[PDB]
Amino acid sequence: GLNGGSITEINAVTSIALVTYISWNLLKNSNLMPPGISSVQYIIDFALNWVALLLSITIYASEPYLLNTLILLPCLLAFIYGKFTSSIYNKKKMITQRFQLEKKPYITAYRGGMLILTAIAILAVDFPIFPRRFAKVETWGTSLMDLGVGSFVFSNGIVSSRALLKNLSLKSKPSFLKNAFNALKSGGTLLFLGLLRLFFVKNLEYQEHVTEYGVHWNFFITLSLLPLVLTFIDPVTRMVPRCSIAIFISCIYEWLLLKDDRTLNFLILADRNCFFSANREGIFSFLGYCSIFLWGQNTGFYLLGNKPTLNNLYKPSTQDVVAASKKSSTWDYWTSVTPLSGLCIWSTIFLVISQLVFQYHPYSVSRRFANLPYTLWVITYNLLFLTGYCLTDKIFGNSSKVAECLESINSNGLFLFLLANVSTGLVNMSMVTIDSSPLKSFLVLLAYCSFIAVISVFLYRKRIFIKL
Ligand SMILES: Nc1ncccc1-c1cc(Cc2ccc(COc3ccccn3)cc2)no1
């Protein structure tokens, strides 16, 4: 585990995604780049999106800051050059238009960057050029490979918020059993893949990873099982908002963990004799994952809309606020917000709460147990990133297509993820990784990235979408 590393290094390493996005937008608006599409656009996109992240993670991990400047300062200059070679929105349209869901570019960029980072890190973990401080921690610590799950849960909750809103828009309430069947149909593929991976592990008899998730439990099972519990709870969430339920669950879990020490002693040093004693880690982390999913849904609630609505800060509503504005009170005026102000409010509240909790916590963070500080840290980081991406989108003024690679990876995330896993397995069976000198490993990584990018672009261009 090597105890991991500090958070500030993690933020400095990850900011490269946002820096590259800003540089790409500047290059697009610089007007020098020729109008028709050609090899130049593809080369520039590949260099900006894939090569920069790989350079940040492995070779230039020691000095990230300098790298960022070398990405931003040149492009900006080119921008100005365009501005020297060269010597609408309607309120009535908003009033007349009803409530519909609208896709946003920054969400696509966010998901594409997340998926690319993961795909790179999965293969990069084996080679020696990858720094050892970024490896996953054993019991207590912070590392770059602990934020991958939290981010995924947050994004899935944000996405499911749109299904919630669309269901609410319908005039007839669907039956509860129909909702359960829809959840089962959604989770069937993940459950089937989990069982297949379990059987493949039986056949492999590979190395033990018991402390990670237990004898039988796995990430796919939890991902498939979350929605069923959410639909079971939704009846209660009708009477009180989701945020209060998440707070209550987290408080109960933390009190149970902290009131005494025998619970920790049993959770850490117990024998594996019966089934419950065999898979304790996954069962106990399920509560934290549920809390993260709930907060992600609540955050996406007002983000995924197209126009401001009444009390969209914590509740799904489709009505209009201007009619209320004739005699709007203080509460109705404060709570009904546009996406940016709501993001800012939640960000500040979570920052202050996280600072207090980190100040007065006796233990450290832990991924195995998914205690309170871990969830707080994940939520605060994700909120900050999302606010940055929204601010960039707003200042650049584009509203109402992001780079090609981001859209291509976003379209077929699951299939490309499985293909990436298969390719990493094959390349590991190909050669001995720990032997390779740095240049050879870098060349191998470059070839693998090129192959994946070519496959993704070819799949997207022919308009073929595969769902597994
Ligand atoms: N190894 C894994 N296994 C299973 C699951 C996941 C992972 C995993 C993937 C990563 C790469 C990574 C993704 C997301 C983020 C934070 O989110 C954003 C959003 C926008 C821009 C930049 N980052 C950091 C780092 N690290 O770990």
Coordinates of C-alpha atoms in Angstrom, one line a residue, residues 24 26 33 40 42 68 71 89 92 134 154 219 221 234 263 267-268 287 311 349 361 368 396 411-412 434 445 463:
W24 CA -9.0 23.0 -26.9
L26 CA -9.3 28.4 -27.1
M33 CA -7.5 26.2 -37.7
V40 CA -4.6 18.1 -38.8
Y42 CA -7.4 14.4 -35.7
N68 CA 0.1 22.6 -17.5
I71 CA -0.3 23.4 -22.6
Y89 CA -31.6 34.0 -27.0
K92 CA -40.5 34.8 -25.0
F134 CA -0.4 6.1 -6.6
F154 CA -21.7 9.9 -8.5
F219 CA -18.1 -4.2 -7.5
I221 CA -22.9 -6.9 -7.6
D234 CA -38.5 5.8 -2.6
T263 CA -17.1 -3.5 16.2
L267 CA -14.6 -6.2 11.4
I268 CA -10.8 -6.4 11.2
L287 CA -24.2 1.9 3.2
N311 CA -37.7 24.4 -5.5
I349 CA -21.6 24.1 2.4
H361 CA -12.0 13.1 13.3
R368 CA -12.6 -0.7 2.6
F396 CA -16.9 30.5 -23.4
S411 CA -21.1 6.7 -26.8
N412 CA -19.8 3.1 -26.1
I434 CA 8.7 -5.6 -14.5
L445 CA 1.6 2.3 -23.8
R463 CA -23.0 4.9 -36.4

